[PDB]
């Protein structure tokens, strides 16, 4: 019989704001046609097969900052989501990216084949435009080194270019390109992108990567000792992860892991099972994060590292590899079920706030994204709303422990191992954040509850240990009768948040296939 206890005195950790981070890759319409305007040679056109003039709508000049950025997209990422950090220039793209192609006067920038996904890249948007965009967006840059074709020397020159404050060739080059003296001061850098993957350019074994990354990490820190470096992990639970952490833990600050739900081989003809395959998927990540926490502490013991080492979950999201393809620029239109998967993802990061310091939604615009653009406008996908609600209400507080009794799902999971190795996922899924208003010292409790069950509703007594709960509760609810309902053009708010205020009586009913964020007052 379902029951939810919350323990505001049992602190997990402060919620890191970088759990709400973003990610932009030079893929499809993420950059050109996304944060920047489309051209007659944006993806999917090219300079030698352009769009016909008759069929090309341009982005109005009104919609652009003076540097050429989309102001409406900026409004969503900065003013609605308050994204604090963005990973760039990618996941797979970066492993054959030469950063020197993307700086200097624009007419001297080298067009390159795009090997990871099959296009052409102009490199009109390179390091200085990315930093300038981050400045307008009020976002911290997070840059990934090329560890596919790239060399250590190229990486050291990039750090010098961005962060050097002396009289040295690459710092002077930055000053010449930007007309300013000040360094970019990029604080976060990642040592490669998925070096473990068979699709990756420059794929390596765990031992070969770890040995190389230890050398790169050591030399990069000599150029700028204040930088935060991120080692390339796999999913957190793999042999790769142990090998890499054992070798990097005294040289880096974070460990990067990636996972997508709705992803992977399965019998897609069994449609009745796709719902449960998708919504319970984030259970795989919490199991893997917990394993990774132990591998971190093993490696720290082994090298006598007193500093904490944290996790960057710097690719998470929802991606079916048969829907979002390289041909269509990884475009996937999300349904309401997908938004319950998204809410489950964010609850994982809250519950694991003591180790997850960064999480990056893959991707922030157009690529498998909460946000879809056209040349003249945009719409927010179903998965945008859980992100919006967590970013607004579960940030700037302390994640606290919960104890949740819930019926379990007996069906097929994706990946299939979650059911057997972790256990049957709970229908209900919750996380809690205690928040203190800095101007008034008023104390509130934000409780985010997903009911993943496709058919059962649950009446749930909710008990708050050692606290009086205020008379009124504010409810932010996401629900639709059709789990296949989507947002799209002309139907932008098919799936949207409903908010209301109710009287608190110590229980709540969580409808089938729903997400509910409750805001409770705690009078002193």
Per DSSP, the residues of 209-269 read: HHHHHHHHHHHHHHH-TT-EEEEE-SSSSSHHHHHHHHHHTTT-SEEEEEEEES-S---TT
Distance CA 513, CA 342 (A): 13
Token pair belonging to 328:
């269509």
CB atoms within 10 A of CB 375: 16
- My answer on whether omega of the bond before 115 falls inside 30° of 0, hence cis, is no
Distance CA 18, CA 359 (A): 6
Task: Report which DSSP code applies to 154.
Answer: H
3 state SS of 290: helix
Q: Considering all CA atoms of the chain, what is the largest pairwise distance in Å, rounded to the nearest integer?
A: 69
At residue 327, φ and ψ (nearest 5 deg) are -65, -40
Can you give the resolution of this entry in Å?
2.0
* CB 225 within 8 Å of CB 279: no
Task: Report which DSSP code applies to 477.
Answer: E
* CB 330 within 8 Å of CB 28: yes
Distance CA 444, CA 474 (A): 11
Distance CA 67, CA 374 (A): 19
Q: Is the dihedral of CA 92, 93, 94, 98 positive or negative?
A: positive
Token pair belonging to 231:
């080692």
Strands 514-522 vs 254-261: parallel, antiparallel or unpaired? unpaired
Alpha helix (H) residue ranges in 321-425: 336-351, 384-393, 417
CA distances from 304 to 47, 251, 507 (A): 55, 12, 48
- Which of 114, 121, 129, 194 is an active site residue? 194
Distance CA 125, CA 136 (A): 15
Strand-pair partners of 229: 189
Method: X-ray
Task: Give me the helix-helix angle, 239-248 and 206-223, nearest 10°.
Answer: 30
Is 194 one of the catalytic residues? yes
3 state SS of 447: strand
Distance CA 334, CA 366 (A): 12
List of residues 6+ apart from 31 with CB closer than 8 A: 24, 25, 125
Distance CA 137, CA 75 (A): 8
Strand-pair partners of 265: none
* CB 27 within 8 Å of CB 93: yes
In angstroms, how far is the first alpha carbon of the chain from the final one?
31
Domain ranges of the chain: 3-10+400-522, 11-399
At residue 230, φ and ψ (nearest 5 deg) are -125, 115
Distance CA 274, CA 366 (A): 23
- HSE-CB at 328 with a 13 A cutoff on CA atoms is 11
Token pair belonging to 346:
């964010």
Distance CA 501, CA 523 (A): 17
- Which of 25, 114, 286, 315 is an active site residue? 315
At residue 8, φ and ψ (nearest 5 deg) are -65, -20
Residue with tokens 């308050």: 82
Measured at the alpha carbon of residue 425, what is the angle toward residues 420 and 426, in degrees to the nearest 5?
150
Token pair belonging to 372:
């879809």
List of residues 6+ apart from 49 with CB closer than 8 A: none
3 state SS of 460: strand
CA distances from 312 to 21, 434, 445 (A): 10, 23, 26
3 state SS of 217: helix
3 state SS of 99: helix
- Indicate the length of the chain as a whole number: 524
- HSE-CB at 105 with a 13 A cutoff on CA atoms is 2
CB atoms within 10 A of CB 418: 22
What is the per-residue burial (b if ≥16 Cβ within 10 Å, else e) of 235-265?
A: bbbbebbbbbbbbbbbbbbbbbbbbbbbbee
Residue with tokens 């904490």: 308
Distance CA 375, CA 39 (A): 9
List of residues 6+ apart from 86 with CB closer than 8 A: 21, 22, 23, 24, 134, 137, 139, 140, 141, 142, 360, 364
Distance CA 145, CA 99 (A): 9
Residue (of 243, 214, 230) closest to 357 by Cα position: 230
At residue 224, φ and ψ (nearest 5 deg) are -140, 95
Residue with tokens 């992108």: 193
* CB 145 within 8 Å of CB 189: yes
- Alpha-carbon radius of gyration of the chain: 23
Kind and range of the H or E run holding 316: strand 310-318
- My answer on whether omega of the bond before 363 falls inside 30° of 0, hence cis, is yes
Distance CA 1, CA 3 (A): 7
Distance CA 145, CA 148 (A): 9
List of residues 6+ apart from 485 with CB closer than 8 A: 335, 336, 382, 494, 495
At residue 505, φ and ψ (nearest 5 deg) are -125, 25
Is 315 one of the catalytic residues? yes
* CB 396 within 8 Å of CB 15: yes
Q: Is the dihedral of CA 489, 344, 450, 86 positive or negative?
A: negative
Task: Report which DSSP code applies to 407.
Answer: -
On whether the 3-10+400-522 domain is CATH 3.40.50.80, my answer is: no
* CB 467 within 8 Å of CB 8: yes
Q: Is the dihedral of CA 318, 323, 328, 333 positive or negative?
A: negative
Residue with tokens 């499809």: 28
| CATH domain 11-399 topology | TIM Barrel (3.20.20)
* CB 254 within 8 Å of CB 312: yes
- HSE-CB at 406 with a 13 A cutoff on CA atoms is 26
Residue (of 487, 517, 474) closest to 388 by Cα position: 517
């Amino acid at each position: 019989s379902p029951a939810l206890d919350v323990f505001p005195s049992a602190s997990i950790a402060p919620v890191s704001p970088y759990i709400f981070s973003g990610f932009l890759e030079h893929l499809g319409r993420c950059i050109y046609g996304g944060i920047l305007p489309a051209t007659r040679t944006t993806f999917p056109h090219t300079p030698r097969v352009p769009c016909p003039d008759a069929q090309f709508t341009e982005t109005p000049r009104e919609l652009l900052t003076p540097e050429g950025f989309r102001v409406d997209v900026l409004e969503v990422l900065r003013d609605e989501l308050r994204v604090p950090l963005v990973r760039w220039p990618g996941g797979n793209y970066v492993s054959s990216y030469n950063w020197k192609d993307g700086v200097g006067p624009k007419e001297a920038r080298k067009r390159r084949p795009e090997l990871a996904w099959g296009g052409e890249e102009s490199n009109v948007f390179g390091t200085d435009e990315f930093i300038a965009w981050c400045r307008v967006a009020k976002i911290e840059p997070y840059i990934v080194f090329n560890m596919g074709t790239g060399t250590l020397e190229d990486a050291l020159h990039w750090i010098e270019y961005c962060n050097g404050t002396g009289d040295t060739y690459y710092a002077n080059l930055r000053r010449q390109n930007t007309g300013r003296d000040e360094p970019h001061n990029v604080k976060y850098w990642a040592l490669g992108n998925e070096v473990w993957g068979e699709w990756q350019v420059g794929q390596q074994t765990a031992s070969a990567y770890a040995t190389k990354a230890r050398q790169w990490a050591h030399a990069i820190r000599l150029v700028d000792p204040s930088v935060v470096l991120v080692g390339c992990g796999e999913t957190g639970v793999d042999h790769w992860d142990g090998v890499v952490l054992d070798e990097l833990v005294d040289k880096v600050e974070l460990h990067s892991i990636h996972l997508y739900t709705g992803f992977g081989p399965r019998d897609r003809s069994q449609v009745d099972k796709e719902y449960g395959r998708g919504v319970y998927g984030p259970d795989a990540a919490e199991y893997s994060i917990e394993v990774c926490k132990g591998l971190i502490n093993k490696a720290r013991f082994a090298r006598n590292v007193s500093k904490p080492i944290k996790i960057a979950f710097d690719e998470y999201g929802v991606w079916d590899e048969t829907v979002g393809t390289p041909q269509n620029g990884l475009e996937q239109f999300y349904n309401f079920a997908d938004a319950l998967a998204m809410a489950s993802w964010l609850n994982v990061f809250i519950r694991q706030a003591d180790v997850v310091d960064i999480a990056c939604i893959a991707q922030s615009v157009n690529v498998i994204s909460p946000l879809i653009t056209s040349p003249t406008g945009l719409f927010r996908q179903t998965i945008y709303w859980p992100l919006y609600l967590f970013s607004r209400y579960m940030r700037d507080g302390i994640a606290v422990r919960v104890a949740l009794e819930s019926p379990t799902f007996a069906g097929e999971t994706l990946p299939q191992w979650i059911a057997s190795v972790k256990g049957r996922p709970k229908d209900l899924d919750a996380s809690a954040v205690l928040h203190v208003d800095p101007g008034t010292s008023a104390r509130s409790l934000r409780v985010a509850v997903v009911n993943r069950s496709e058919h059962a509703s649950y009446e749930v007594p909710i008990r708050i240990a050692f606290e009086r709960v205020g008379v009124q509760v504010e409810v932010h609810e996401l629900w639709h009768q059709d789990v296949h309902a989507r947002n799209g053009w002309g139907k932008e708010d098919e799936v949207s948040v409903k908010t209301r205020t109710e009287r608190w009586n110590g229980r709540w009913t969580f409808r089938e296939h729903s997400f509910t964020l409750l805001v409770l007052e705690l009078p002193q």
